[PDB]
Design a binder for this molecule. Structure first.
Ligand code: HEM
Ligand code: HEM
Ligand SMILES: *[C@@H]1O[C@H](CO)[C@@H](O[C@@H]2O[C@H](CO)[C@@H](O[C@@H]3O[C@H](CO)[C@@H](O)[C@H](O)[C@@H]3O)[C@H](O)[C@H]2NC(C)=O)[C@H](O)[C@H]1NC(C)=O
Ligand SMILES: *[C@@H]1O[C@H](CO)[C@@H](O[C@@H]2O[C@H](CO)[C@@H](O)[C@H](O)[C@H]2NC(C)=O)[C@H](O)[C@H]1NC(C)=O
Ligand SMILES: *[C@@H]1O[C@H](CO)[C@@H](O[C@H]2O[C@H](CO)[C@@H](O)[C@H](O)[C@H]2NC(C)=O)[C@H](O)[C@H]1NC(C)=O
Ligand SMILES: *[C@@H]1O[C@H](CO)[C@@H](O[C@H]2O[C@H](CO)[C@@H](O)[C@H](O)[C@H]2NC(C)=O)[C@H](O)[C@H]1NC(C)=O
Ligand SMILES: CS(=O)(=O)Nc1ccc([N+](=O)[O-])cc1OC1CCCCC1
Ligand SMILES: CS(=O)(=O)Nc1ccc([N+](=O)[O-])cc1OC1CCCCC1
Ligand SMILES: CCCCCCCCO[C@@H]1O[C@H](CO)[C@@H](O)[C@H](O)[C@H]1O
Ligand SMILES: *[C@@H]1O[C@H](CO)[C@@H](O)[C@H](O)[C@H]1NC(C)=O
Ligand SMILES: *[C@@H]1O[C@H](CO)[C@@H](O)[C@H](O)[C@H]1NC(C)=O
Ligand SMILES: OC[C@H]1O[C@H](O)[C@@H](O)[C@@H](O)[C@@H]1O
Lengths: 551, 551
């Protein structure tokens, strides 16, 4: 079997087999040397003694309101802090990308084939003695048992940060432009070849789909008016394929950019908001540019909406998640004096960690209805009976579930949580502790240390034996969360790098693009640079309801 | 008609229409301001005063042989010079890319659709009063007339730099991995979606083709043995599509990575050399790695060959072209402390300028045969009749034609030269002088100044009227060349940026890839870092003949 199964190489050094039973580590630019890249260079030891731990930096950012209010208001100083956040996170990601499910060594196939999700760590080799490498038993614990003992929800657990349903559905809507697993092929594959924020969930992945949804007048997307209100067009009308079950009335089969968004009214809400937003921007642009044709109006709006999305994600969405008193900034300019790759590749592990189903409540509370999952799923008529305004008002009020901390995955979606484990396993994911090391974190030394608690840790011990064979997905959902927070440490420390690179790594953030001319002048550039979750809802939802990502 | 037709914005500022008859320049980061980006900031004026002209820098590098021998031998100092060469050229290229034949403004379509060649300058708008913008006549001179008066060859003109046929065919073979125009679609489109040095002309563009050419044993490519010598397999044996005319014997229908390489024995020679090289490297790797399977052997050899190719292109091929006494270096490490994008996109204008047909001789002299074009094209039996060794020996001896300076396109390929003009026109190429400005060069003020000569200038004047409507392609092939050089100034000053970005912009040059482990250890890394045109021929051609890029 493979020499590198034990994952002997430390500190991001590369393991390469040298014989049938021997291996060599490659310690190039790791700042370490010796057989396993475990001995630090001199300047490395100074830099490690100094560099503070992530839980420390987190505390700092979530305390001392006073000091931050000073910082938040000195532009130079805020820019500098944001610049540190962006760069330190960034250089934790391989870019251009390296590994995938089929390639544990770098290769032209792995690089050039955009069908694969990339991989943060190589897969465990097809022939290691144990699933996780060398440690633990011949088989991993049964996945249903892992699910039931520590993932499934007993009483619903509210998010202490107060994330609402507006947040949850925004998260789902947003991430599903670049988490589009190609199930024909397998879990390691993707239909999202844009590999990032290209708004293909609004505009469509292929050109054939885009052209089927476009109106071809003033840049606008096709739509329909029902009860005086703007909604997406139908499958029948556009010829755009959508996943709907047979029993659905043809006029409630809305056709949007992403074929799965019919499944959930929460998604279809955002689909509609974003369709309205596009056409609003075409309207603004048609006024500033009477000379432009349909094509440029469409193209330009899309770039404006990309910018808006990135802005809202950073300054509202990520902001809300962070819990920081520091105010994050979307300013491409902060990277212009930096080594940064304006490219992205969606990593499988990023997809895994973003399975935030604990957010989902037991029932959906719109107006004074309470809808079971069975009631909610597919029922686009709920979105019409109540209308967008009541949706926004109710979803802003209803609280989401806590993700970390264990035992909060809704029973209605248990099959989904199971599949995340089973697919982790098919894709030969490395262990929790390997990922922690990969992103510069002390490996958990015991289950009690991981959960911060005795009861679930005991259950996990009798399922896994060794903390070092604990799997990544279940770990994320049971981890002791930061104090009064939604996530544990691993979730943030893996997630933030992928997230920021997904956002900042967009071509529109590049110097040659980040100019007002790209967005049709001062006006367009201004739309992007003052966008917010609130302005998005306000401009496009009748009555301009107040919204935020928290109750 | 479009406000921006005059190309009013200077110094890389972006023109955007603002009404039906008005426009606005965007001078962001140009270092200039004012209505047309014509007035320099203070620090700009200092930097422009100081910065020496390209003809000056060229002279320096091609004289003072003594001084350079000192430089060539102080590693620190050579590294510093090479670093300047790489960065100054690089920041002339839009990366991530911007315009294409269909998009004169930035757009997601332009960015994300890999089917288009990118564009260094936007196309002239579909509705301008004149083909070149506003200046010149309603029609451009007849392309057949431009060809005949100043492009077609009278007396063959030898290249004063002494480039041989080994150079010419290397150029053709190399560039044809990324100049693969998709003629079904149109001149602005490409079949080479790798957009750079991915060796698809050896391994094939799609995975189907690759799998059809692979042996699946020890990493090797399929081959046949004829007269004791290794040659490519056949179309019949592999099922790999190739462009051969019907009359060709099935056993001389060799199947290589790139479908057009049957056309010309010169190409089939390199095809065979590179196939031999791949298999050689599999052999070396199999010895260093008895534990590796077929897949990793193949994959790793490919990476080694990408490195070899890049090395040979920089240190031999570009070296020979340059005429420099300074010795260029392929060292990815020189870019690690720099802002550099590890991505490439083949520009259309890069394709246009590389149509170096003047290189071709009137007849092909192999051993003591002289072959007409009619005799040469398609005759793969010539390559067997003489064998690779005699091919290398004869091609190394036979001198190529001068490219710049006018009147040196072989009559046999006149249709090709015409199409380069006609397609420049279909793709709405901007004028010569616009491209000179785009790459930081004084616009030519007269034809006499362009050609350095009176006779052709007179002919051109009576064809174009205004120097400012002179087309890019014909200009390249008539330009006054640098003294005793193959090319004129424009050719180098446009080409070099595209070239270096094509080479350095490869993923294997990125810090995460540029490690010995990527190439299977010290041995593989060493193959790459000591590769040359000689060693390539020596290792793979019977008898190890001496070769170089010049007679
Ligand atoms: C109540 C609404 C929801 C339902 C019915 C639902 C159900 C599902 C189902 C059936 C899958 C199948 C894909 C797989 O097997 O991996 C899936 C995938 C996924 N879900 Fe959800 N989920 C919901 C909400 C959410 C939310 C709020 C998030 C938060 C971000 C989320 C994140 C994800 C992600 C990242 C995937 C991966 C699928 C892919 O890669 O295409 N889901 N969900
Ligand atoms: C063996 C002699 C050669 C012949 C018969 C030949 C023939 C051709 C032909 C028929 C085309 C297609 C023209 C079109 O677009 O319709 C072409 C394109 C081209 N040629 Fe040549 N050529 C020869 C040598 C060379 C050499 C020595 C170079 C050196 C760089 C070269 C560079 C190119 C390039 C860059 C293209 C563009 C092809 C594309 O866009 O895919 N050729 N050649
Ligand atoms: C890359 O951009 C190119 C060039 O625009 C895209 O090619 C184009 O694809 C369309 C639609 O898929 C072609 O077909 C035309 O549309 C209708 C659809 O109802 C179809 O039935 C007809 O056959 C019709 O001709 C269009 O001609 C084609 N343009 C070409 C070949 O020049 C290509 O799809 C883009 N790639 C991606 C990934 O978007
Ligand atoms: C990306 O990789 C996939 C998977 O390796 C390639 O798909 C394979 O293609 C071969 C030959 O066409 C088939 O025999 C396999 O069945 C395919 N795997 C599948 C369908 O899952 C795919 O071709 C590669 N991408 C590109 C752009 O070439
Ligand atoms: C580097 O890591 C390797 C592989 O994990 C270490 O392997 C050794 O440690 C085992 C655990 O006690 C020994 O009992 C094994 O015999 C031994 N395995 C070998 C040599 O393959 C190794 O000690 C490490 N080396 C250094 C210098 O730290
Ligand atoms: C910027 O460029 C434009 C055109 O290139 C200039 O426009 C005018 O130039 C002349 C001098 O004012 C006029 O007589 C022309 O009518 C007009 N040219 C065209 C083609 O419309 C403009 O002046 C320039 N700006 C500055 C500050 O010089
Ligand atoms: C660059 S960042 O500011 O450090 N991102 C980030 C910081 C802190 C938290 N958090 O919940 O403590 C979440 C974050 O966002 C990512 C967004 C994607 C999911 C994972 C966390
Ligand atoms: C980066 S570089 O070293 O400055 N390139 C370069 C310098 C000088 C010459 N030349 O002909 O004197 C050719 C060059 O290469 C390119 C090769 C492709 C065509 C254009 C010139
Ligand atoms: C509602 C989801 C639970 C379904 C049964 C899961 C199988 C048993 O799960 C058990 O739950 C008990 C109470 O939470 C705990 O005391 C035990 O640690 C746990 O093993
Ligand atoms: C769809 O929602 C409506 C409310 O408009 C509800 O009456 C109905 O039960 C739902 N359909 C299903 C199948 O649950
Ligand atoms: C190929 O070369 C041979 C060399 O003897 C010559 O007779 C002829 O011109 C060529 N023939 C064909 C069919 O290509
Ligand atoms: O070798 C490529 C191969 O992939 C697999 C098969 O399903 C075939 O369709 C195909 O020929």
């Amino acid at each position: 079997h493979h020499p590198c199964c034990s994952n002997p190489c430390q500190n991001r050094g590369e393991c390469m087999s040298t014989g049938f039973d021997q291996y060599k580590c490659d310690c190039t630019r790791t700042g370490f040397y010796g057989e396993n890249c475990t001995t630090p260079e001199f300047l490395t030891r100074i830099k490690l003694l100094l560099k503070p731990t992530p839980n420390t930096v987190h505390y700092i950012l979530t305390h001392f309101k006073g000091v931050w209010n000073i910082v938040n208001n000195i532009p130079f100083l805020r820019s500098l802090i944001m610049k540190y956040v962006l760069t330190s996170r960034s250089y934790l990601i391989d870019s251009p990308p390296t590994y995938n499910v089929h390639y544990g060594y770098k290769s032209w196939e792995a690089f050039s084939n955009l069908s694969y999700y990339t991989r943060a760590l190589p897969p465990v080799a097809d022939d290691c003695p144990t699933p996780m490498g060398v440690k633990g038993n011949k088989e991993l614990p049964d996945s249903k048992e892992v699910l039931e003992k520590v993932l499934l929800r007993r009483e619903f657990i509210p998010d202490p940060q107060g994330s609402n349903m507006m947040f949850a559905f925004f998260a789902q809507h947003f991430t599903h432009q670049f988490f589009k697993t190609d199930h024909k092929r397998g879990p390691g594959f993707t239909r999202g070849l844009g590999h990032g924020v290209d708004l293909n969930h609004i505009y469509g992945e292929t050109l054939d789909r885009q052209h089927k949804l476009r109106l071809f007048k003033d840049g606008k997307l096709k739509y329909q008016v029902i009860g005086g209100e703007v909604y997406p067009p139908t499958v029948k009308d556009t010829q755009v394929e959508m996943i709907y079950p047979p029993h659905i009335p043809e006029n409630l089969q809305f056709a949007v950019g992403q074929e799965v968004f019919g499944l959930v009214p929460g998604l279809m809400m955002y689909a509609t908001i974003w369709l309205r937003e596009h056409n609003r921007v075409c309207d603004i642009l048609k006024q500033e540019h009477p000379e432009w044709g349909d094509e440029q109006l469409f193209q330009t709006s899309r770039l404006i909406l990309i910018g808006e999305t990135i802005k809202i994600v950073i300054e509202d969405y990520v902001q809300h998640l962070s819990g920081y008193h520091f105010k994050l900034k979307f300013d491409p300019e902060l990277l212009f004096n930096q080594q940064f790759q304006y490219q992205n590749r969606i990593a499988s592990e990023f997809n895994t960690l973003y399975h935030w189903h604990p957010l989902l409540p037991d029932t959906f509370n719109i107006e004074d209805q309470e809808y079971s999952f069975k009631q909610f799923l597919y029922n686009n008529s709920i979105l019409l009976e109540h209308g967008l305004t009541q949706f926004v008002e109710s979803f802003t009020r209803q609280i989401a579930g806590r993700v970390a901390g264990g035992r909060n995955v809704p029973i209605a979606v248990q099959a989904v949580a199971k599949a995340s484990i089973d697919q982790s396993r098919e894709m030969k994911y490395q262990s929790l502790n390997e990922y922690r090391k990969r992103f510069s974190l002390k490996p958990y030394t015991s289950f009690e240390e991981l959960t911060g608690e005795k009861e679930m840790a005991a259950e996990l011990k009798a399922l896994y034996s060794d903390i070092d064979v604990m799997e990544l997905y279940p770990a994320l959902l049971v981890e002791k969360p930061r104090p009064d927070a939604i996530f544990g440490e691993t979730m943030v420390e893996l997630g933030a790098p992928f997230s920021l690179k997904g956002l900042m790594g967009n071509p529109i953030c590049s110097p040659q693009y980040w100019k007002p001319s790209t967005f049709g002048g001062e006006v367009g550039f201004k739309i992007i640079n003052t966008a917010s979750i609130q302005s998005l809802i306000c401009n496009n939802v009748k009555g301009c309801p107040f919204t935020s990502f928290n109750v």
